Design a protein around this ligand. Structure first.
Ligand code: CLA
Ligand code: CLA
Ligand code: CLA
Ligand code: CLA
Ligand code: CLA
Ligand code: CLA
Ligand code: CLA
Ligand code: CLA
Ligand code: BCR
Ligand code: BCR
Ligand code: PQN
Lengths: 731, 107, 105, 164, 32, 64, 107, 80
């Protein structure tokens, strides 16, 4: 009766879905009772403080458990033959072989081998002792408490901001380019130059001597003079032992390319020059805008003047500032699109260009980080389109958007959905056709009749980047071109000696299996956008339901009439796209994991012969590498992979349980729950015990969300157990 | 039709009971084998669940040519007990022992 | 059975909920002590099986007794104070029943 | 050798894989009498196999390090190096038949729209009209570009929409 | 060294038992 | 006079929320009274509910 | 059941290529296809596919190739029937190919 | 309770009232159609939202229209 304090209509619900929807539309602030736009913005501001405080508390917990139950100081001495430690295990349910099986890494109690990569990230930014990590945990715990105080105090009425303060898009986009991105990257270069560079050279720079230890031996005179090349005179040698001064080097802002020869990682000197350069460019781009000083540029004038005539984009970008600034789901959709793309960018560029010392030797760390940020990017990219669909129902106004790009998008929505349908249908037809063709050829003992289309277009890009394996000799693999010649002192030879190494992940050599699986990835991307764009554009209406905007974003159906309207809502079209999203990210991580397993084992031909046909994916990757996984426990005993043997089944159990909410739908279950209500209300001495919420079955939208949640959790837990065990068992 | 609620409610109960006390035995064995505790499992070398009733029926159907079917020269099959018929070097039929895993799969 | 149900404490209206909770507690105590003491995780030790099977049983009685007061604050014998007296009587009676199970070993 | 490749008549993994398949067929053949019906079919399988290897080496297909023929799907690397029969010739040998079927079905729909009830001649196909459109659809790209020059290929915004 | 033997039963058996209790009592409260 | 289209003229629908928007049917009767939706149009195209006829107003109606 | 039965005894259907059992190697893949294909029908619903059919009926209207028999999405109890039929086919034929490729080889 | 609104596209063929399993709907005099009658929803407290009314409405883009709102013990269709 009380628990949805935000929803007085849910508070009058005598059933048990009062609890389930009090938990589920609690953060849909716009649908709360008595909500105004000012209280909306105030609750969102406090919510962002809560998210920041949780992120800092989480990082401080990582730091504290590494400093306390980990072997970071032991890992610094030997980062190749020592496994990292996440946290100790206190499980009273263990037996003695389980206690003795999880003791490794040089510890005494049972421990977990961390695959989050945090030792490689902390060791390259200057952490060497546990006392450097306790200070970080205490600092981030203090900053998390400060953000909890801030989220409490900016809700207090002397400190509650106005409605007009949140709609200052001009000042926010000024300050979050100049200050939050440029000054922060300049300060991170200040951390790299002052702390990470001398600690990589073996000189301790802590909080006691950073005002007394020069980063450069003639420091701040070449910056004020003009000869900035003095900051790049002596880099680290090719015999540099990391963390010591054996062939150290003295430069702070070098520009080399390629990798450190020991750590197989990016040099910290040109990572410093990287963050310094993009700090300068972010400061220049952040003094572009006109807030309160007369000079700059205005968001109200640039938008409604970029309109091309003669029916090119219609009325162009006329009327967007009334709808970008007023809508939060449009801003959240653009923000999620940007974050989900640059998260895929983080994932693609942290395996090929590993930024951290002794990363890409720890293979399980690399697989976990890639698969982690790729699923994070897949969920964030499907939520970009989800909030883009919430925009068209809740926020879109056609009379405010007369003729702009956002109305022309809805005007030819059928052309968009039909062309995405064509591209997805073409890609699936021919990708499945060539895979089934190669399977039929492998079955009949004739591998030569396979369609093995060579990836010509991407081998040309590798050869234009300097990979001399294919002989296209176009720009950087040609020794006579101008793009080759005008960078031989600047950044090229380390990059050319790093590509042509066939043992890093920097531009792997590719063949017909990589053709087929990049077209599988294109199938997945175009089909996921087919489902998401079709859900965003038909969110307001269709010929089956011309008033879909009248029912809102999430609703079950419109009944059995008009042929039947199961899954008609835009929520239910996000819903079906999460399956194709998990499919797509599963394809990219199957492909990443198996090409890297065959790379790390040595036999890239074992991939190149088997990845051309789906039986080779089934038995040379799934069947083959899940041996030591499933042998985590057996009647002979158990080992340290048994926790991944359990979770691999645990993920198989949640996944199938999702199908119970997916295949069986509500109304079978309400009829079962009514017989259970009968049995409880007619049982002797159980009549005394009576509920407060009337038991009903889960609603239709709720059944979708619960089945999708179990599907995704079982999907992620199965592949995480398989990935970690399959990599860290043989390595 | 006038006590379908009683029928479906008691069958709901016996399905939930059979689900816990059949599949939770497998989850228990998974957990004990994963927690390094193979003695606490449900097996023949552990907590035993012997199918006493089916084993008794196997004994009576193997001893049926003795006194309950006196004109049978052998038992009606070889699964009840005895020797094995071997044809061409391969086993045609041999006796079938029923143990703890047989109990768990029959439930 | 209308005659048999007029005997067990949950239907005896003319008796107090304290004694009702006490008889329910001692009548469930040596019952629920059984599966912890006969087949628990520490069975094959003839010192600790009867100790752990009683300590876990008394903890489960404590869980049920907290859970009764949780039900009593949820729902409101059928009063807010009568169910609290029932919960306290069940705590005392169930721990007494687990101790009585440890006595009759 | 276009992209790290090699001619199949030059590579040795291709010949080793031919000898591997013929070795499997030979040790399979060694069980039977030389004139029996399985041995004739096994030797015919060997003859088709050797003819397949000879005609894949003859057409200049490119093998890889695996010893398997590859397909260069780019004109200008297929036209310049003589690989147009890999993809570039069947990418029009397909599209003639694809636009053929897409034109025959189009004209069968349009020639049955203007009748009493069209749907009865879509479950019960008018076979003389179907075979007339099957034969006279042979010059479909000609008729397709002559229909595109009118604007009678497309339809204007008489089409059915929802709420733009 | 006694911290994982004390904080882990509190966080999993005691403080969720508060959270199974106090967050459940808040559900069925009669609105005044 | 008889307002609306004639007894059997082909017509085009301008109701954007209709199933037969921009789609051609036959007028079968026009009601001559103060009815809001007098023009009765029968279609060969049936809708999702299986109905081939609908009433329309005078502004939602244009010939050919 | 995962290791010693599914993983261990699938070791003859997965390497059956280049033999007479290789059709069992194909159907084991193909029935893994059809089964999962059924999950498109079981999990989704009609009001999605009817609107997708609207968006491609527009494309067939634009190129004058709309059929006179109007494309509809499958019915609710038709899509459930398609899903359960493809689910049963893809599971039973998977087990068919697994069983026969196991037992023709090692039996 | 659910929100059951009707609209002036009603032809008065009273099929939503016969289709209604809960007597939410009833026919009211009106002068916008030939049948001289239009529906009404006086009893939307008893509505469950099962939308049998708008499986029976013949008018294109249905004249009756149920909007699923808050759920009481009558909107959830409970005998308990
Ligand atoms: C990042 C974590 C986070 C943050 C900052 C908030 C923040 C907030 N929640 Mg919230 N919540 C969260 C996670 C979070 N929640 C989770 C995981 C759940 C369970 C699904 C809930 C369930 C929940 C409920 C049920 C309610 C809130 C409410 C609130 C608001 C007080 C505040 C804006 C309350 C609210 O918005 O009412 C004004 C409220 O009633 N939250
Ligand atoms: C220069 C002044 C300044 C600064 C520094 C900030 C800073 C911030 N504001 Mg803010 N603000 C300002 C002025 C400023 N504001 C003004 C003037 C206004 C009024 C117009 C506002 C109005 C405002 C609102 C309304 C909100 C904020 C929010 C925020 C927070 C952003 C959350 C986040 O994580 O993004 C920072 C993101 C990053 C640091 C990561 C991305 C950076 C790159 C591109 C990614 C790749 C590199 C990556 C860092 C590598 C990672 C490696 C390793 C660290 C893992 C942040 C604390 C939000 C918030 O959380 O509320 C407190 C919010 O809702 N501000
Ligand atoms: C916001 C970032 C930041 C901050 C707070 C500092 C702060 C400082 N720097 Mg520093 N520095 C930075 C970025 C930063 N720097 C960058 C980006 C570079 C590379 C160009 C340098 C290169 C640099 C040199 C070469 C020297 C300093 C020095 C100093 C110190 C005295 C400055 C007078 C002071 C601790 C000087 C000093 O006293 O050394 C300790 C000194 O010699 N810094
Ligand atoms: C910056 C990120 C961000 C923000 C602020 C929002 C904010 C919002 N979203 Mg959005 N969304 C996002 C990202 C974001 N979203 C992403 C990435 C996706 C894709 C996954 C979505 C998908 C999405 C949908 C589909 C919907 C929203 C909705 C909403 C609104 C209500 C929030 C709500 O229902 O909370 C309550 C949320 C919950 C109670 C979450 C349920 C629990 C989930 C399933 C996690 C379960 C995992 C489980 C705990 C794992 C445990 C494993 C176990 C074994 C231990 C709110 C405006 C809703 C809306 O606007 O309604 C109209 C809506 O329908 N969003
Ligand atoms: C293995 C399972 C599987 C498969 C094959 C598909 C296949 C497809 N989905 Mg997906 N889908 C799945 C699971 C699957 N889905 C799941 C679990 C969900 C969640 C409910 C979805 C949700 C979903 C949505 C929401 C959408 C799709 C779409 C598509 C289509 C994408 C276009 C394409 O690739 O065409 C290629 C076609 C194929 C790969 C299959 C054809 C198989 C062969 C070639 C047909 C002929 C074989 C043979 C001759 C037939 C003999 C049969 C009989 C006579 C014996 C395609 C039909 C989109 C769509 O319709 O795009 C237009 C779309 O909008 N799907
Ligand atoms: C692996 C997947 C899975 C699982 C576990 C279930 C589970 C169940 N289904 Mg179900 N179902 C599934 C898939 C699954 N289904 C699918 C895919 C479909 C699609 C057609 C259906 C369709 C379906 C129907 C149509 C029916 C069921 C029924 C049932 C129930 C009968 C079993 C029972 O009560 O035993 C007890 C429960 C289990 C065996 C589940 C596992 C519990 C383990 C053994 C121990 C408990 C956990 C332990 C206490 C730890 C808790 C930790 C704590 C933190 C919470 C149960 C809820 C029937 C039902 O509800 O009536 C009885 C019924 O009528 N299901
Ligand atoms: C996806 C588009 C694409 C890409 C990436 C390439 C890529 C390339 N083409 Mg190419 N090409 C394409 C489409 C494409 N082609 C098409 C559609 C045609 C017309 C049929 C051609 C005609 C063509 C010729 C005629 C030539 C190339 C050449 C080249 C190479 C320089 C490089 C490998 C050149 C080459 O051989 O490499 C030096 C060359 O001479 N292309
Ligand atoms: C949250 C984490 C957590 C922790 C720390 C424990 C801790 C324990 N569990 Mg366990 N358990 C948990 C979650 C947890 N459980 C969950 C979620 C489930 C359901 C899936 C189970 C299901 C489970 C079973 C089925 C069994 C255990 C058992 C045990 C005990 C192992 C035997 C041992 O070494 O003690 C040696 C010492 C003893 C056996 C003496 C008894 C100790 C009791 C149980 C302590 C009770 C504390 C206190 C007196 C009462 C609680 C008060 C309350 C306010 C917190 C140990 C006390 C075994 C056991 O004996 O416990 C009953 C057992 O059979 N657990
Ligand atoms: C639903 C919707 C939505 C959403 C949307 C989305 C989600 C989108 C996405 C989008 C995206 C996701 C996009 C992307 C893009 C990308 C791009 C555009 C890229 C670019 C790149 C480039 C251009 C590059 C270049 C280069 C190269 C080529 C290489 C070398 C270097 C250089 C730089 C030169 C919203 C909310 C709005 C609302 C409406 C509707
Ligand atoms: C040629 C062609 C194509 C393709 C196709 C495909 C791609 C297919 C595939 C498919 C797949 C991808 C899969 C499949 C599978 C199948 C199956 C799987 C079947 C089955 C059947 C049956 C009939 C069964 C039976 C049985 C068994 C065996 C077991 C039990 C008993 C029974 C009797 C039930 C294209 C389009 C290009 C063109 C056109 C034509
Ligand atoms: C894909 C899908 C559809 C779309 C499926 C369409 C409607 C049918 C697929 C095409 C069929 C096979 C017709 C195509 C063949 C025609 C007979 C034309 C043949 C032409 C030549 C081959 C002769 C649904 O309608 C549906 C409904 C309810 C739940 C789930 C779903 C669902 O998952």
């Amino acid at each position: 009766k009380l628990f949805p304090k935000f929803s007085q209509g849910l508070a009058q619900d005598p059933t048990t879905r009062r609890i389930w929807y009090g938990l589920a539309m609690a953060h849909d602030f716009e649908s709360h009772d008595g909500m105004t736009e000012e209280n909306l913005y105030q609750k969102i501001f406090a919510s962002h403080f809560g998210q920041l405080s949780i992120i800092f508390l989480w990082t401080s917990g990582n730091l504290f458990h590494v400093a306390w139950q980990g072997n970071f100081e032991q890992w610094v001495t030997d980062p190749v033959h020592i496994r990292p430690i996440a946290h100790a295990i206190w499980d009273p349910h263990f037996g003695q072989p389980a206690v003795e099986a999880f003791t490794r890494g040089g510890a005494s109690g049972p421990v977990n081998i961390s695959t989050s990569g945090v030792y490689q990230w902390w060791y390259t930014i200057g952490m060497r002792t546990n006392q450097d990590l306790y200070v970080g945990s205490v600092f981030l715990a203090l900053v998390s408490a400060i953000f909890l105080f801030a989220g409490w105090l900016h809700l207090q009425p002397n400190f509650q901001p106005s409605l007009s303060w949140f709609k200052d898009a001009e000042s926010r986009l000024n300050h979050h380019l100049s200050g939050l991105f440029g000054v922060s990257s300049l300060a991170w270069t200040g951390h790299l130059v002052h702390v990470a560079i001398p600690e990589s050279r073996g000189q301790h720079v802590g909080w006691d001597n950073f005002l007394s230890v020069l980063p450069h031996p003639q420091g701040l005179t070449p910056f004020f003079t003009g000869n900035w090349a003095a900051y790049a005179q002596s880099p680290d040698t090719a015999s540099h032992v990391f963390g010591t001064a054996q062939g150290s080097g003295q430069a702070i802002l070098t520009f080399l390319g390629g990798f450190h020869p020991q750590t197989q990682s990016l040099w910290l000197t040109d990572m410093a020059h990287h963050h310094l350069a993009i700090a300068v460019i972010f400061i220049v781009a952040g003094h572009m805008y006109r807030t309160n000083f007369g000079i700059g540029h205005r968001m109200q004038a640039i938008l409604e003047a970029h309109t091309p005539p003669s029916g090119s984009l219609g009325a162009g970008h006329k009327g967007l500032f009334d709808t970008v600034n007023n809508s939060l789901h449009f801003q959240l959709g653009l923000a999620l699109a940007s974050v989900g793309t640059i998260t895929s960018l983080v994932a693609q560029h942290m395996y090929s260009l590993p930024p951290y010392a002794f990363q890409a030797i720890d293979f399980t760390t690399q697989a976990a980080l890639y698969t982690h940020h790729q699923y994070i990017a897949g969920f964030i990219m499907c939520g970009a389109f989800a909030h883009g669909a919430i925009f068209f129902i809740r926020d879109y106004d056609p009379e405010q958007n007369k003729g702009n790009v956002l109305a022309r998008m809805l005007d030819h929505k059928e052309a968009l959905i039909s062309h995405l349908s064509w591209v997805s249908l073409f890609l699936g037809f021919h990708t499945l056709g060539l895979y089934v063709h190669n399977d039929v050829m492998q079955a009949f003992g004739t591998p030569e009749k396979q369609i093995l289309i060579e990836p010509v277009f991407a081998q040309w890009i590798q050869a234009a980047h300097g990979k001399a394996l294919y002989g296209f000799d176009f720009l950087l693999s040609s020794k006579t071109s101008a793009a080759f010649a005008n960078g031989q002192s600047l950044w090229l030879p380390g990059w050319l000696d790093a590509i042509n190494n066939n043992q890093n992940s920097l531009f792997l050599t590719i063949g017909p299996g990589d053709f087929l699986v990049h077209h599988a990835i294109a199938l997945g991307l175009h089909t996921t956008t087919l489902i998401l764009v079709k859900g965003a554009l038909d969110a307001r209406g269709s010929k089956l339901m011309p008033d879909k905007k009248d029912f809102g974003y999430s609703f079950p159906c419109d009944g059995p009439g008009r042929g039947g309207t199961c899954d008609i809502s835009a929520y239910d079209a996000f819903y079906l796209a999460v399956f194709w999203m998990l499919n797509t990210i599963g394809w990219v991580t199957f492909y990443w994991h198996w090409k890297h397993l065959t790379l790390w084992q040595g036999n890239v031909a074992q991939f190149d012969e088997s990845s051309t046909y789906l039986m080779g994916w089934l038995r040379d990757y799934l069947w083959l590498n899940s041996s030591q996984l499933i042998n985590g426990y057996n009647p002979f005993g158990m080992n340290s992979l048994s926790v991944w043997a359990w979770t691999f089944l645990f993920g198989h159990l949640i996944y199938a349980t999702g199908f119970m909410f997916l295949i069986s739908w509500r109304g079978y279950w309400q009829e079962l729950i009514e017989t259970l209500v009968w049995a409880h209300e007619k049982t002797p001495l159980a009549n005394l015990v009576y509920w407060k919420d009337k038991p009903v079955a889960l609603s239709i939208v709720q059944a979708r969300l619960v089945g999708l949640a179990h599907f995704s959790v079982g999907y992620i837990f199965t592949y995480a157990a398989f990935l970690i065990a399959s990599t860290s068992g043989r390595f | 039709i006038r006590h379908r609620d009683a029928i479906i409610s008691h069958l709901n109960w016996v399905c939930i009971f059979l689900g816990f006390h059949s599949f939770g035995l497998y989850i228990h064995n998974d957990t004990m084998s994963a927690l390094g505790r193979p003695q606490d499992m449900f097996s023949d070398t552990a907590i035993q669940l012997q199918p006493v009733f089916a084993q008794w029926i196997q004994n009576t159907h193997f001893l049926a040519p003795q006194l309950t079917a006196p004109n049978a020269l052998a038992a009606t099959s070889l699964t009840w007990g005895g020797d094995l018929v071997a044809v061409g070097g391969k086993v045609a039929m041999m006796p079938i022992s029923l143990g703890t895993s047989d109990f768990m799969v029959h439930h | 059975v209308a005659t048999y149900l007029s005997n067990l404490p949950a239907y005896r209206t003319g008796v107090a909920p304290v004694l009702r909770g006490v008889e329910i507690g001692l009548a469930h105590g040596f019952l629920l002590a059984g599966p912890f003491i006969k087949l628990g995780p520490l069975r094959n030790v003839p010192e600790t099986a009867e100790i752990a099977g009683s300590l876990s049983a008394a903890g489960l009685v404590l869980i049920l007794a907290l859970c009764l007061s949780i039900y009593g604050s949820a729902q409101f014998l059928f009063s807010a104070d009568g169910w609290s007296e029932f919960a306290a009587g069940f705590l005392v009676g169930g721990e007494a029943g687990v101790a009585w199970a440890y006595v009759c070993t | 050798d276009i992209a790290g490749l090699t001619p199949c008549s030059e590579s040795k993994a291709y010949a080793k894989l031919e000898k591997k398949e013929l070795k499997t067929l030979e040790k399979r053949l060694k069980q039977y009498e030389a004139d029996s019906a399985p041995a004739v079919a096994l030797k015919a399988t060997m003859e088709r196999t050797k003819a397949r290897f000879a005609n894949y080496a003859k057409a200049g297909l490119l093998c890889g390090n695996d010893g398997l023929p590859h397909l260069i799907a780019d004109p200008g690397l297929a036209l310049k190096y003589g690989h147009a029969g890999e993809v570039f010739i069947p990418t029009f040998g397909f599209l003639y038949v694809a636009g053929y079927i897409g034109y025959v079905g189009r004209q069968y729909l349009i020639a049955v729209k203007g009748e009493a009830k069209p749907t009865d001649k879509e479950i019960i196909i008018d076979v003389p009209l179907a075979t007339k459109l099957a034969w006279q659809g042979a010059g479909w790209p000609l008729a397709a570009v002559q229909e595109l020059q009118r604007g009678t290929l497309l339809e204007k915004e008489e089409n059915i929409t929802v709420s733009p | 060294s006694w911290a994982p033997s004390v904080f882990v039963p509190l966080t999993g058996l005691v403080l969720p038992a508060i959270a199974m209790a106090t967050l459940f009592v808040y559900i069925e409260k009669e609105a005044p | 006079k008889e307002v609306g289209p004639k007894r059997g003229s082909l017509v085009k629908i301008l109701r954007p929320e209709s199933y037969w928007f921009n789609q051609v049917g036959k007028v079968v009767s026009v009601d001559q009274s103060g009815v809001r939706y007098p023009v009765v149009v029968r279609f060969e195209n049936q809708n999702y509910a299986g109905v081939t006829t609908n009433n329309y107003a005078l502004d939602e109606v244009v010939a050919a | 059941w995962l290791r010693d039965f599914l993983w261990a005894q699938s070791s003859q259907v997965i390497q059956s290529y280049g033999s007479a059992l290789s059709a069992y190697g194909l159907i084991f893949l193909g029935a893994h296809f059809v089964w999962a294909f059924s999950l498109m029908f079981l999990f989704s619903g009609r009001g999605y596919w009817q609107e997708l059919i609207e968006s491609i009926v527009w494309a067939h209207n634009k190129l004058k190739v709309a059929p006179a028999i109007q494309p509809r999405a499958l019915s609710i109890t038709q899509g459930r029937a398609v899903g359960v039929a493809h689910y049963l086919l893809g599971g039973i034929a998977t087990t068919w190919s697994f069983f026969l490729a196991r037992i023709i080889s090692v039996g | 309770a659910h929100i059951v609104k009707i609209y002036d596209t009603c032809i008065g063929c009273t099929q939503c009232v016969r289709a209604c399993p809960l007597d939410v709907l009833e026919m009211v005099p009106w002068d916008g159609c030939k049948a001289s009658q239009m529906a009404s929803a006086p009893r939307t407290e008893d509505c469950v939202g099962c939308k049998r009314c708008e499986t029976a409405c013949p008018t294109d883009f249905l004249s009756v229209r149920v909007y699923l709102g808050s759920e009481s013990t009558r909107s959830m269709g409970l005998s308990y």
